[PDB]
Structure formats: C-alpha cells, structure tokens
Design a protein around this ligand. Structure first.
Ligand SMILES: Nc1ncnc2c1ncn2[C@@H]1O[C@H](COP(=O)(O)OP(=O)(O)OP(=O)(O)O)[C@@H](O)[C@H]1O
Ligand SMILES: Nc1ncnc2c1ncn2[C@@H]1O[C@H](COP(=O)(O)OP(=O)(O)OP(=O)(O)O)[C@@H](O)[C@H]1O
Ligand SMILES: [Mg+2]
Ligand SMILES: [Mg+2]
Lengths: 367, 332, 342
C-alpha cells in the first residue's frame, strides 16, 4: 500500500533524469507506460513491448539497466541481456528454446526459457536487433504476441507481464539528420523571438519528432529491414533517441568530472575542481559515430592517465585541493577561431593539475 | 500432560532453535497440536511435503520436530535419504529381498526400523532425487501406514509421522516471494504470505511433472512451503551464528566475544541468494573463526579476556581491557 | 609441533608455489586441529585450476599430514570411472536381491575402516551430475548408507575435491593480473619506489570469484545446494617464471639425490641450463611439462652414459650451455680438468 506513495515521493522520471540526462521525451514515455503497468491499470493479457531506435552508445542499455534496477533489486536475476549480433544464423534460434528430443542439449533446454522460468516478470533487453536476420525475430513474434514460449521439451512458459525491450541502431542516420534540422529550426525561432524582443513566452528545450516524418520514412524503413509487418504490429511503443545536444553534453562533462571528484574525495579526500575552458576542451572531442563513448574515452585519455600518474607518483597529498587547468600557451590558440590549413597537424591542448594550498598559492605538477 | 505442553508449546522451541519461517513453523505446529489433542484419525498417519530452496531449514525443521516427539533419535527418528534411490531396483532397500535370493534373511531396512519404533518420525530426505517407482512403493505407506516385508511380515505405522523435504517447486515460490520481497517489505505486524490458489494452479503442474501420480499427492496431508530469507532474518542468522561461536568459546575457554550493530552488515554482504543459511554459516566460520584459531595456537588469547570484532576504517579482532584501550592482534 | 613445523612450511618444502592455496588449506586444517571446528559438518574443499599445478599432490600431502603412514587413512575416488548415472551403486553397494549385495560398498567399507580419513574426489568434474546426490547426502551431515542399510557416520572426515572446471578462466585471469602487476612493477622501477616492500600476492578478485566462477560451476555441476554444501573453494594459479626456476631446481635436486643414492654420482648445474630447461615448458601441461622435459634432455643422457659403464662411481658431473643457438655431460676432475662425454 506504500508503493504508490513512494512513487509519488520519488517518481522514476526523476530517477532516470538523475541517472541519464537528455532525451526527456523517451523518459516521459517509458515512465508513463511503466506507471500504467505498475498502477494495475493495464491489460495483463499482453506484455509491455518497447522498441528504442537510437545512435551508437547513446545510453539505451543504460536506460534499460536503470529501469530494471528500479523495477528489481537484483539485476542479475530480474534483468536479462541478449546480444542479437551473435545470433545471425537460424541455429542460434535453437538456443532460445533448446534442441528437439533426440538431439544434443535436449536436457539443457533453452537459456531464455530457463531465464524466464527463473524470473517471469523480468526486464528483458535485446541489443542491436537489426543485426539478427528476422528469422530469429519470428520466435519473438509470438513471444511478444501472447507472452508464452514453447521450448524443445514442450513445456510452455507464460510471461504475460515481462517488459520486453528492443534496442537498435537502424535508421539512426535519418533521425540524426531530421533532428539536426529540428535543432536548426528551433534555434532559428529562438533567435527570431530574441530579435523580436519577446521574452514573455517561455518554451522549454523539448524537441519531439512529428507524426508525418515517422509515417513517411520510419515505418517504411522498418518494414523494409524487418521484412515482416506482423513483427512490427505487436510492438507496444516506438521510442526515438535524439542525437546529442550541446548543453546536455556540457552537463555530461560536468557529471563525468564530478564523479571522479566524488570518488577521489571518497577514497583519499581529494577535492577536484574544474574550469569552463576545461569543459570546452573536453566537449570538443565529440564524435557522433562513437556517441558518448568517444567523449568518455577522450576524458580518460586526457585526465585519467594524468591523475593516475600523479597518484602513483605520490604527488597528491591527503587533504589537498586540486584544480584542472588548460595550458597557458594553448588558451591563445583556443581564442582564435581561424580555419586551419589541411597540411598542418592539429595539437590537442594539454590539461594540467594545480595544487591550491592553505595560503592560496598555486603549485604546478609536471611528470 | 497438558500443563507441560502449555508451558512449552513447540512453536516456542522451534523459534528458539530455528529462525524465520513463521508460517511453516505455525503449519507444522498446528498439525502436531492436532496430533497432540488426540483428535486425529487413528487410521491415517501424518504426511508432509516440504517445498523450499537450498539452505532454508527443512531438514533441520524435521530433525528438531523428531527431537521433540522422541527423546532418542537413534530409535524415534528414521531418516532415509532419497539420493540412493535414483534407480528402479533401489526399491529393494525398503523391503526385504524375495525368498531364495541374496540378503533375504537380512530383511527390510524400513520394516525393521518401523518395527523397532512404530511411533517414530520418518524423514524421506530430498525426495526430488528418488525414482518415481519408489514413490509408488511408499504410496501404501502414506495411504494406510502398512508395509509388507519380503518374508511375508507386515508392519503397521498408523501412529507415525511422515516428513518429506523436496526441492522441486523451490524456484517459483521464491520468485513469488520475490514480488513479496517487493511487496511485504514495502507494505511497511508485516508477514510474507503465499496465495492459496498458487498451490493448486501452478505448483501442481510441477508436482505432476515430477512425481507424475495423482495418488501420491492426494495421499499427502499437508504441503508446507519455505520462504527465502529476508533482510532481518539474515541479520538474525548472522547474530545467531556469532552467538553460537561465542557460546562455544565461553563453554570452552571462557572467551567473551562482542560485535556491534554495524558489524553484521558486512557479513550480510557475504551472502548468495542461490545458497542458504549454510553460506552465512561458513562465511562466519571462515572470516572470523580462523583468526580466533590462529590466535589460539599462538597463545595470544588468555582465558577471561574480552574480544571485539571491528570493521576496518577487514574484520579485526581487538582485545578490550578494563581500561577501555583497544589492542590490535598481530596474526602471523 | 605445529608451532615449529606447521602445515604451511612442510607443504611449501614439499610443493613449490600456490601460496594462497596452501594458506587457505592450512588455515582450515589449523581450525580443525585446534578443536575449534564444528562437529556436524565435515570439511569440503573444491580445488580448481589448470592442469599440472599440484592439487592431487596437495591432497596426498594433507593425507600424510593427518596419518604419518600411507595406504590407510587416505581414500581417493577417481571420478573418471563414475561418468554414468548408475555408478552410484559403486558408492553404496548393491541393493538386496541383486548381484554383489553381500560385498557392500567400497566407499562404505573404506569409511568403516576409519571415519576420520581424508577422502579425495579426484577429477570430480568428469562425473555425471547425478552421482553428486550422494555428495549432497555426505556433505550435508556426514553419514552414508550401505547395501544393507548400515548408516556409517563420517563427521570427522575431510573431503577434498579436485577439478579442472574454469581452468581457462582462472589461468587467463591470472595471466591478466600478472600482466597488470608487471606493468605497474615496471612503472615502479621507472618511478624508483623501492622503499615499500611489494607484497607480490596476486589473488583472484571477489568479483571474478562471484560473477564468472559461480555460474560456470552452476553450469557444470547443475545443482545449487551442492555448491552450497561446499565449504571452501580453493583456486590454483599457474606458475610464474620464478616458480619454474624453483621447480627445475627442485627436480634437479631430486635427480641428483637419486644418483647419490644409486651410485654416489654428485651432479651440478648452472643458472643458464635451468633457464634453457624453463624455455622447454608449456603452460597448458603444467609442471608435468617440466618433468618429462628433464627426461627428454638430462636423464636420458645419463642413462645412455651409464649403459656403457662410463660412470664407475664417485665422479662429479656438470651440465653446460649449448652453442648451437650461438645437453653436455662433463666429468670434472679433482684437479678441475673437465672432460666432455658423448
Ligand atoms: N532457519 C534457520 N535458522 C537457523 N539455522 C538454520 C536455519 N536454516 C538452516 N540453518 C542452519 O543451516 C544448516 C542447513 O540446514 P539443513 O542441513 O537442515 O538443510 P536445509 O536448509 O533444509 O536444506 P537442504 O534441502 O539442502 O537439506 C542447518 O543444519 C542449520 O545449522
Ligand atoms: N606445484 C607443484 N610442485 C611440485 N611438484 C608438482 C607440482 N605440480 C605438480 N607436481 C608434480 O607433478 C605431479 C602431478 O601433479 P598432481 O598429481 O598433484 O596433479 P595436478 O597437478 O593436480 O593435475 P590435474 O589437475 O591435471 O589432475 C605431482 O605428483 C608432482 O610430482
Ligand atoms: Mg536446513
Ligand atoms: Mg591432479
């Protein structure tokens, strides 16, 4: 009786916003559908079927993992992860259900059948479902249709309430192009409202894909790739992951530096602080092709190796305060927005650690 | 003898010796109280089927029950392990061999044990591992409590109590308790309850897929479920294992042991959901007691001293003197 | 007796390597021998590792520690012959009315001789996973029923189980931990931090102990209460290069001792011939890859020399460095005049 009051205190939209910044339309959609499920105002005869279309490494697996962590205390048993890139051939279809009688691994059964037996209402996630040929997806047709799966032994498992989540990278380029168009148009109307000196109207930064674009391109490309309209029919909701925006990337840089500062304070009482130009240099390495993975690895290659070298060199005393700074001779290069020649090599501006003492004296560290 | 049973009900003894399982203990206590009042049907013995996961306490519950009903377990407790009876011919370990064959004069083991004590509690331990034919052998033992030996002799055990522990439908009820772990703990007395339709709509397909006979499940009087341990039950288990070791130390060499409220959290952190009370038991036995034995060899623990388990700012054993000064022990 | 020559030092002199494994085994043996062990539960150890590490020899030396004599208090069952479901009767004897009922079980008779014995289930991963229901019964309380129903108590026994499951996992993670330790050690050589004594005890991390090893044991053994009843799980790491040097030195000590007992032929060697013996080694075959290699390089040459009576007795030998990349048995004289033998 206290679960609805707890969710009234801390809804999952705030929990997911704390865990993952950006794409608040996706958060609102998954929160509303989950709220319909967990309130009880939901048709139990069919499972909750999510499809996420996104770019590479945008946080879809993190979103499903945090959803399963919110739903279940144990994510080892209450959450299932399956990589569809491995399951190219129809032979891998067998390991959903196990072999027929008379064959090898008949007593083994299916891994998925035993996994749904061990947790019938688990959050189940398949990543990159476009990699698998839809002959694999033909099992999941009836599995999303009625929640019942038949194995090789003939035991029928019934999971009518399991949240089944698909995540895919298909049509990521078209969503990226259209969302770049919408970002340019929204910046155009924002600058029009600025130039008309109208500040009474307040519009939040919520850009949502319109219906006509979806009906024009997304349903035909999904029908063409999946080659089966029936598999697209059982999907309870489609969700679009918009490509990364500037201010949320800045907030991402702030949080991925803040986590290292918090773990430094937790382990060795090391208070790390940052600069705005440090955040600019870290957000400069933004690659859409790797998604947030490129920014995270750029953060690692820039500051994590330097902080590790300072830690193993024992040059960070306990109880001290540290500041991450940009090199002085590179800020002048940052201040010049000139187009570089293609025959000149590009130099990454270095990052340094400064010690702030009790007498407000800056100490430099070079290793 | 009603005064003695009013002084010491078996629920008090069971809660004194095993923790958790407030519904299973109450169920077996209600059945044993029905036996104690003299208003059970004297033609039919009591049959129990225990459904629980690993390390929950079914075998210990049967042992403590048969310790209550009979003072000697060498006569009043007959335990047969079904791990031998994996094959169809293993049936011949209950009854005697047919006449003219090997071991015919040796007789039936279960018939001899029931003839030694007809009131004795019989524990069919781990009845998952039995062959389905052995189930049909003890079909008549549950139907009337009457078993025919290989020599033509026939033993009656209408007054006996039959306990079986099983592992077959242990996952699903645990999964059921999983939502109860997200409901009964979030209901905040508070209790963890298994729904009444569950035992007939879902559990009976597993019981029919494993035991395959309607008559075997019909002959069993009571189906007793065992629920997985909660957080407070794991706390009580940690304190019970530590109190067992402290009592053993005080009985052996007069060594007082202390643990704070904060110490039990890192011991509950050493727990497997697939395991049971034995995981917490040997985790206590390894992490704490090995340092005690190492200090006891090294003569670092004189008798009458007071020891405190402290979490590192590792479980460190600190000697507490009368002057409130902690002394760390350096173990080689 | 334990305070001067414990299990740790005798095991380290008899078996090289496996510091944490001997530490865990001797800690549990210490708590058993002090009298601070629980009487109900017999000790269950599951030994995991690659091939040629020394788990069977560790169990043999533990059994010789319990009973100074051999052949009596050491009951070893090899689960290569237990790969069928119907081999359970080999534990317990035949049921009444069937062939071999009067002979009883062999395990029952051997635990009837002595109940405090060291029982070694060797290569226990090879057994069919219905045989281990008897292991459920025996590890639960320590009692075993015969063909005639005679329940034998076994509460003073020590059960040691050796296996090869997760051998690739343990070996590959130990190789990664060795690589990372060598990287940070080479950095420490670069950083000149020699003022801190480096405790070179590479152990398996608890995340690796709990997230990959427990699922693969659950996949091979196919039961959860079985892994619950196992008290201690002891891993075995593969050797590092210093351990190979110590092992080749120990084996050459063994062969020099054998020659001294046979015809008093004192034998000597050098560091470089030990290094070229360590070069002939494979990580999969383990210490056996060392052992026969000596017989493929050294002892065959001594046997060939002794067949044509070239070593009458009392002579001193030395083994040298090959020049083909740039083994020789050399008799050294009392005047230090070496002579090569063919
Ligand atoms: N509820 C409990 N309270 C206290 N101690 C317990 C409890 N359950 C188990 N234990 C301890 O753990 C041991 C394991 O229990 P036991 O050997 O009786 O089997 P079990 O838990 O019924 O499981 P299995 O089905 O594997 O036999 C007990 O001997 C006892 O020492
Ligand atoms: N660590 C070691 N130290 C010394 N000798 C060893 C060691 N490992 C193996 N040996 C030698 O090699 C022999 C083979 O080892 P053993 O019989 O103990 O099996 P093992 O290494 O556990 O192999 P497997 O796991 O394949 O059964 C030993 O009898 C001993 O002579
Ligand atoms: Mg128990
Ligand atoms: Mg071996």
């Amino acid at each position: 009786k206290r679960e609805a009051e707890e969710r009234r205190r801390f809804p999952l939209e705030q929990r997911l916003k704390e865990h993952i910044i950006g794409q608040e339309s996706a958060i609102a959609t998954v929160g509303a559908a989950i709220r319909r499920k967990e309130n009880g105002w939901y048709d139990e005869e069919h499972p909750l079927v999510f499809l996420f279309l996104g770019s590479s490494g945008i946080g879809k697996t993190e979103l499903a993992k945090q959803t399963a962590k919110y739903m279940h205390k144990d994510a080892k048993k209450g959450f299932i992860r399956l990589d569809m890139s491995e399951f190219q051939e129809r032979h891998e279809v067998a390991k959903f259900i196990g072999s027929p009688p008379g064959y090898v691994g008949h007593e083994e059964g299916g891994q998925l059948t035993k996994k749904l037996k061990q947790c019938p209402n688990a959050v189940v996630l398949f990543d990159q479902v476009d990699k698998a040929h839809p002959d694999v997806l033909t099992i999941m047709l009836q599995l999303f249709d009625e929640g019942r799966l038949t194995d090789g032994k003939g035991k029928t498992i019934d999971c009518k309430d399991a949240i089944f989540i698909m995540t895919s990278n298909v049509a990521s380029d078209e969503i990226a192009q259209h969302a770049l168009q919408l970002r340019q148009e929204a910046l155009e109307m924002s600058r029009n409202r600025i130039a008309e000196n109208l500040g009474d109207v307040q519009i939040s930064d919520k850009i949502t894909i319109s219906k006509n674009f979806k009906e024009n391109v997304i349903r035909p490309i999904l029908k063409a790739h999946f080659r089966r309209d029936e598999f697209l029919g059982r999907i309870n909701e489609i969700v679009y992951f918009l490509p990364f925006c500037h201010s949320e990337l800045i907030q991402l840089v702030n949080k991925e530096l803040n986590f290292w500062a918090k773990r430094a304070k937790q382990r060795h009482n090391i208070t790390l602080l940052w600069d705005r130009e440090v955040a600019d240099v870290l957000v400069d390495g933004y690659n859409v092709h790797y998604g947030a993975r490129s920014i995270k690895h750029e953060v690692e290659r820039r500051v994590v190796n330097q902080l590790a070298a300072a830690y193993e060199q024992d040059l960070l005393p306990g109880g001290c305060t540290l500041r991450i700074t940009v090199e002085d001779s590179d800020k002048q290069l940052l201040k010049s927005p000139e187009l570089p020649s293609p025959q000149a090599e590009k130099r990454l501006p270095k990052l340094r650690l400064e010690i702030i003492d009790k007498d407000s004296k800056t100490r430099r560290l070079d290793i």
